[PDB]
Symmetry: C4
Subunit: 671 residues, 4 copies
């Protein structure tokens, strides 16, 4: 048998005292008042005493919203401490007003009434608390190293982190940003960015800072949603302290704000500037118009170069026409690169007619990249992540040009390629040119963003490449390990190239040999084993060492089982799990990326596609009025949605029970 | 006949789904309080 | 502008008449009674009139559960029709009792009060209706062809199907089976089986019959769940009209009833008859005991053959020991089959020592199969779906024996196999023996059911083989189509075997040839193209018909794209979707299959593993008492669970509003 | 385990290796069965190593031979058939026993269909189902494993890395 007792004993209540608390619970005003006036005389019943479940009489009256017993206890001067916070968390405006008019606690000591109101996100109570001059202390920097922060971290790191988290949850309140903020949209933007940075820094408290940042982004989105006219939309988007607030939203990565339908509609009607009725057109006439503009890019470009002030000169300044001209010029560049592959023994030859055409687009690409560098700056250049491969293309083109010039100057004769040197400058130049050709032709992935049916697909690829990168570390570790083992076994039986039937050594021969003789060749062989191009007899030696053969063969088999059966199917399962997490927000992310692509063409800089590129208090007052109407509409909408969602608990049933019982004792008293 | 049956069916299904919010609790609270001030007035 | 009107106009109510219905809605008894006694005199207000929303005064009183206005209207003799059914659907026992004591309708004409009560599944109302002698008409056979059924199908097939569905939904009520049934468990079993058959037949009304069958199975499971002692469990399982009801449940495929924890515990303690403490033992001692019993199967078998009445004779009659002995004998048979592969030029040789051992297990397997046939019967034999491959094994073994005997009798000499005939009886016999070896060795999949970690895996394979079978039709259609096309192109360039370098024709040669010359070889080639074993140069001819080559190559490429890229990934996606639908019920299905495997060993027949197999109203009364206690417990449990689930709608809020308003007009009247 | 972005990935591998181990029993049973059948058919036509063009016997030669002559070599051949490194003409004999050839070839085809088409896609579906059950608690399991790794270094014993500990 197990004895049961109370190992942590407390102070029990007496019979009359339990009767008093029970009368408070059922709401008998006559009995409670009689007990109070009897206690004032006899000092028998403690009015500030506790209950078995953690509450006192004022707490019971507050949770049961019985304002009349609550004010009776206030008039009898019961203990008051933390009951204000209890009324704040209870969301009872009458209790809040009465306690403003005048041990164990389930609240942290930092909990201030404004902060608990900001947690409860109740606009009424937050505004009544803000009516009095009440202050929230400022959080320090994200990476602050001052003496106060290091002392608070050293003394009690749990209370420091809880205090910072408590401050930021107070500040991220949608009601507390709707009031007491000169610019709620910009405040929500900066607060969301800061909460994202604190989510990145504080690893353990990551999810709560993530959800606070998401709450701020949702608040900004709904505030934009409450607009009701195109002027108000453009006052919001064009406020600066054009499209300044939109550029700020793009800078702070507010994809929910950017992907608003009204903002996307305004961006679309700015994008289709020259064509007012592109929204309602057929597929065939859209394709015909696109090809018609795309076949006239040199005419429009030379029109801009000659006279910007004409029906054709400023026609390319429209964003869609500029995008079509850039795409058409780049596609003609790729067509010429395809034509370039269509005497070959000259050492360091002069450039042909096709390369003589290619050279100005190469110079224009380099000039455009360095012009974007010099104009935008550094962080904006490195943030794009396409400029890395753009730099790779420019570097490979420059290397090809330099090697071609070096070969043309240094060599003159016509020697057949069969006896050329292996590190010949012409060979190096042509290899670099082919690599740059591939990089140029995969640069077209960036144009899938502007299409409706390919943009989310590109977003899904960009989100699953991260998991491919995660898997590549494990696969390369396994590859290095098995390459090391197979080298350590097989590098005694290395054979010269002369002993081979056709003077070829390596896995690229007709008869594959020496697949595990050197570390480079072992890495190549175990890489090509994934696609099945490495035959089985590469695990063979001329000597009769059958045990050596069997250990090498089972090493190869273990590598194949780990890679193709385990790791590849692991990669399939990982990307399949990752795709479902992206399919929900793919539309929003695609709309954000397409907005960035659209705003990339709104500038006057970079207008000419290559190779042609080498040849004020009223605004504040109107914005304040629009935001004031927006805040009123948003508070009304979130009040309506609070009165439309579920919201109901057993609090409501015990509230109705309390009202019925208080009335019951009232009419039993009056009758 | 189909429209009469459909209106009856969707009324029944409106009276069979969840449909309830804190509007209903404050409605009952309002009825109880209005009655309360009524009988405090009559008595 | 669109005009709006009432295209289907109805009869509006007058002002006093709307006032009367509004007074009924708010529950003013004084106003309603005054209006009734005024209408009795003046004939100005129609008491049976309709409202804008389809109801009358009695309907409003019934839906608002206001029994006092409802009985007032009953005393004033308002229209009564279908208000009883309205009270049945409303689940108000007072309204039901009062209407029992005494146009447009949203109910079908077949709706009878007992049937609507059975739909509502309210035990109280169903019992009050059953107190009066009330009858439900019998549904006919599933495939009945009588004149009444064919006439009802021809006259109005919608009303016939709705009537049958209405009858079966009435009969499948858990409360209506808990009452008025001599055997609720057997009634639920037969009703679930019949509803499954009607689900199979009625294709359009499939889901509702499926959910009714599932409801009956759940009712039977919960009725078994309400047992509270091992005697009651065994009275339920051992009732017959041993384990007769359990065998009936297995026959009717009640997997939920079979997979009950108490039933599985009783089956386990019958299964581990000889070992009382196998439940609490270590893995190593379990493995040691299993190998110890498995290495002694001939000793236990010969002990049973010599003397069944001993410590060793009846030791094999225990189910676990019998299962271990069968498994050990069959594993030794497979070990001998492995040994059989370890002079070869004799035409029709005598059987060797290993085959002379194999022959009695072959005879024992055939004898056991025909004995199971003769004992169990026909439907039980063909239902197992393992007996098909068992028959295949027996037929191949018999064919091997017959061909070996024919070869031994007909041939005597010793000719080397290089010049044997291609259809030689020895060659045919050895091919059939190898095929039977594979079938014998994959017969071990059936033993994965008895294991804890492999049984659900076998269930998942058995459920995804259906989708593989579904996909195989499409793949074989594509295979036949592309084989036909490639034959029609390539069968002009068929070359003889002599013209080949090594006198070999077909895709099984060193140099693959003639892959699309005949239909059989084209089917083989396009089958082997799936696994990559068919090289690319099989699409080549000796002549210089390059267009012919290109069309053949692009046909091969289109087939590879359809098969490996589209169809194989389709199969992967289909099985991945199918696995998630099986992972939920895999435990229940595995427990059912393991119960079937356990009951297969409970019989005295088939005790000896091969080759050794060729060498009473008190029961009804106790069952009735146990079922009566079970029904009382189940009704109490489902009443408690009805008072524990959500169950609440705006019906409850308008009920409380009606009570408050009726009281309000009452006290305004009394004061 | 000590890394933020690789620890849950290692946990996911450690949880899907159990399902790979579950599948390996069925695959090895099928492998043993088809190896037994192909041995029982093909072990009459075993050829010596001397008769071969380059005195090599087995599936590791230039010309693959005797893939189903012994049980060890049949197990090796039907293992290497999974990755496609076993050519089709290993189901060939010098004699003109075309029925023997056809039965051996359809045995090889049935094994390939069971393994690559059915069983491998079964393994893919099984690990894909198993990964979703682990993705929810991967963070908690990784934090537990990293806590164990951290507490492994809190002791004074085992302070010196090798070879300084001797
Ligand atoms: C993102 C990362 C950066 C990407 C862009 C990098 C641009 C780099 C540009 C620099 C190009 C230099 C070319 C060689 C000239 C010097 C020379 O004589 O070479 C010597 C050595 O030659 C080598 O080692 C070959 C180097 C080839 C690099 C190819 C990079 C491809 C990246 C693909 C990426 C996908 C010749 O041999 P020897 O001395 O006579 O003996
Ligand atoms: C489930 C389905 C049923 C399964 C069990 C079936 C049992 C059947 C048993 C019958 C076995 C008969 C053997 C041949 C004897 C007759 C003969 O002379 O054959 C002649 C023809 O030979 C053929 O056509 C070969 C037939 C081989 C069938 C193999 C079935 C494998 C099923 C595997 C399934 C996995 C010889 O040629 P000729 O005339 O000299 O010219
Ligand atoms: C001697 C060796 C010779 C080898 C010869 C052959 C070389 C072949 C090299 C092929 C490389 C192909 C790389 C293709 C990348 C495609 C990426 C598709 C997804 C995608 O859009 O990714 C973007 C990231 O940028 C990127 O993914 C940029 C990738 C840059 C790669 C640079 C390689 C040099 C995300 O989009 P976003 O960046 O707009 O997202 C918002 C801002 N973060
Ligand atoms: C000239 C050609 C020469 C060819 C030589 C090589 C031939 C190789 C043939 C290989 C055939 C392999 C068949 C393996 C089937 C495994 C099935 C695993 C799943 C499973 O347990 O399936 C059960 C169904 O039975 C079944 O799946 C029974 C399958 C019977 C196949 C018979 C083939 C003859 C379901 O379990 P359950 O039946 O207990 O479910 C409850 C009652 N429905
Ligand atoms: C003649 C033949 C010649 C053959 C030559 C080549 C041989 C190659 C052999 C390669 C074997 C590779 C084994 C790699 C296992 C990696 C496991 C990754 C997942 C992982 O961390 O698994 C842990 C389990 O330990 C493990 O998984 C431990 C695996 C130990 C394998 C030992 C093999 C001997 C789980 O993590 P945890 O254990 O911390 O989990 C908490 C405590 N349960
Ligand atoms: C991720 C990183 C961690 C991976 C942890 C390990 C995963 C499982 C590894 C299993 C390796 C099996 C190697 C077998 C072997 O030696 O074969 C080569 C050699 C080749 O001669 O095989 C043999 O010598 C034995 C012949 C029978 C092999 C049976 C293998 C059955 C299972 C195959 C894999 C599943 C499909
Ligand atoms: C399921 C049943 C219905 C299937 C419906 C169709 C599905 C898509 C079929 C696509 C067939 C493409 C055939 C290409 C072809 O002729 O190649 C052979 C031949 C071989 O010479 O290809 C050519 O001659 C053209 C060379 C370029 C081919 C580019 C193909 C890109 C897409 C490949 C498939 C996706 C990966
Ligand atoms: C898991 C363990 C249990 C597996 C249960 C069975 C699953 C399905 C097995 C199907 C085997 C088909 C074997 C076909 C055959 O003999 O081919 C070799 C041989 C090679 O000569 O094929 C033939 O001789 C016939 C040529 C036509 C074959 C058509 C096959 C269509 C379906 C292919 C598979 C699906 C892709
Ligand atoms: C991939 C195969 C078909 C070979 C053809 C290669 C290129 C000639 C293709 C591949 C990608 C194509 C691009 C994919 C998407 C677009 C966006 C498309 O714009 C829209 O979606 C129209 C609506 C809008 O811009 O608002 C204009 C054509 C363009 C650049 C396409 C131009 C032609 C490209 C470069
Ligand atoms: C697949 C590899 C490892 C080669 C070995 C082949 C056979 C020797 C194996 C494969 C399947 C095995 C069977 C799988 C499952 C079981 C059930 C097992 O019983 C239990 O799970 C114990 C608990 C109980 O029976 O209640 C007894 C052994 C047995 C028949 C195994 C016996 C050994 C078998 C036949
Ligand atoms: C796989 C490719 C890139 C070849 C390189 C092989 C090794 C040189 C790599 C592969 C795995 C790497 C390890 C992966 C993870 C870590 C944890 C990392 O520690 C952290 O994550 C820092 C934070 C912390 O420890 O709290 C320290 C480096 C280390 C041991 C890495 C060291 C370098 C390793 C051994
Ligand atoms: Ca750029
Ligand atoms: Ca059987
Ligand atoms: Zn600081
Ligand atoms: Zn009938």
């Amino acid at each position: 048998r197990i004895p049961l007792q109370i190992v942590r004993a407390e102070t029990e209540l007496s019979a009359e005292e339990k009767a008093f608390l029970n009368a408070v619970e059922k709401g008998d005003y006559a009995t409670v008042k009689q007990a109070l006036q009897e206690a004032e005389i006899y000092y028998n019943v403690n009015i500030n005493c506790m209950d078995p479940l953690g509450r006192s009489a004022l707490l019971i009256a507050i949770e049961n919203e019985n304002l009349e017993i609550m004010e009776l206890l206030l008039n009898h001067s019961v203990y008051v401490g933390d009951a204000l916070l209890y009324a704040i968390r209870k969301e009872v405006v009458g209790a809040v007003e009465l306690l403003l008019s005048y041990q164990f606690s389930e609240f942290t000591p930092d909990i201030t009434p404004i902060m608990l109101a900001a947690h409860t996100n109740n606009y009424e109570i937050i505004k009544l608390l803000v009516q009095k001059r009440v202050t929230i202390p400022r959080p320090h920097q994200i990476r602050c190293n001052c003496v106060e922060c290091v002392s608070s971290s050293e003394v009690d790191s749990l209370r420091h982190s809880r205090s910072r988290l408590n401050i930021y949850k107070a500040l991220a309140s949608p009601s507390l940003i709707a009031l007491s903020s000169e610019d709620p949209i910009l405040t929500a933007f900066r607060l969301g960015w800061e909460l994202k940075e604190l989510s990145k820094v504080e690893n353990e408290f990551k999810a709560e800072y993530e959800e606070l940042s998401q709450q701020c982004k949702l608040f900004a989105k709904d505030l934009l949603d409450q607009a009701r006219s195109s002027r108000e939309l453009e006052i919001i988007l064009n406020h600066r302290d054009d499209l300044a607030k939109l550029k700020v939203a793009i800078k702070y990565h507010q994809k929910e704000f950017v992907a608003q339908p009204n903002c996307q509609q305004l961006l679309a009607t700015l994008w289709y500037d020259g064509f007012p009725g592109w929204r309602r057109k057929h597929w065939v006439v859209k394709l015909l118009t696109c090809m018609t503009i795309g076949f006239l890019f040199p005419m429009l470009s030379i029109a801009y170069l000659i006279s910007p002030r004409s029906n054709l000169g400023l026609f390319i300044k429209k964003p869609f026409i500029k995008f079509i001209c850039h795409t058409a010029s780049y596609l003609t560049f790729l067509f010429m690169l395809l034509l370039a592959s269509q005497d070959l023994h000259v050492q360091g030859p002069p450039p042909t007619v096709v390369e003589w055409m290619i050279l100005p687009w190469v110079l224009g690409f380099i000039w455009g990249e360095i012009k974007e560098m010099w104009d935008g700056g550094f962080t904006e250049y490195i943030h794009d992540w396409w400029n890395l491969m753009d730099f790779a293309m420019n570097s490979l083109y420059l290397a090809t040009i330099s090697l071609k010039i070096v070969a043309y100057v240094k060599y003159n004769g016509s020697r057949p390629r069969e006896e050329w040197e292996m590190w010949h400058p012409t060979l190096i130049a042509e290899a670099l040119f082919a690599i740059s050709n591939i990089l140029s032709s995969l640069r077209l992935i960036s144009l899938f963003t502007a299409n409706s049916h390919l943009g989310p697909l590109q977003i899904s690829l960009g989100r699953m490449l991260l998991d491919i990168l995660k898997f590549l570390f494990i696969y390369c570790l396994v590859l290095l390990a098995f390459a090391n083992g197979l080298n350590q076994l097989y590098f005694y039986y290395e054979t010269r190239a002369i002993d081979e039937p056709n003077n070829c050594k390596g896995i690229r021969c007709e008869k594959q040999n020496n697949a595990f003789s050197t570390l480079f060749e072992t890495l190549q062989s175990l890489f090509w084993s994934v696609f099945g191009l490495l035959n089985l007899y590469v695990t063979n030696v001329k000597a009769r060492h059958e045990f050596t053969e069997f250990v090498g063969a089972t090493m190869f088999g273990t590598y194949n089982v780990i890679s193709l059966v385990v790791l590849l199917n692991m990669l399939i399962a990982m990307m399949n799990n990752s795709y479902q997490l992206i399919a929900d927000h793919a539309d929003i992310e695609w709309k954000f990326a397409r907005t960035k692509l659209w705003m990339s063409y709104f500038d006057e800089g970079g207008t000419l596609p290559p190779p042609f590129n080498i040849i004020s208090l009223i605004q504040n007052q109107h914005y304040q009025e629009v935001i004031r109407n927006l805040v009123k509409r948003y508070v009304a909408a979130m009040i309506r949605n609070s009165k439309t969602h579920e919201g109901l608990t057993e609090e409501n049933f015990k509230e109705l029970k309390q009202d019925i019982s208080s009335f019951r004792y009232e009419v039993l008293d009056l009758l």
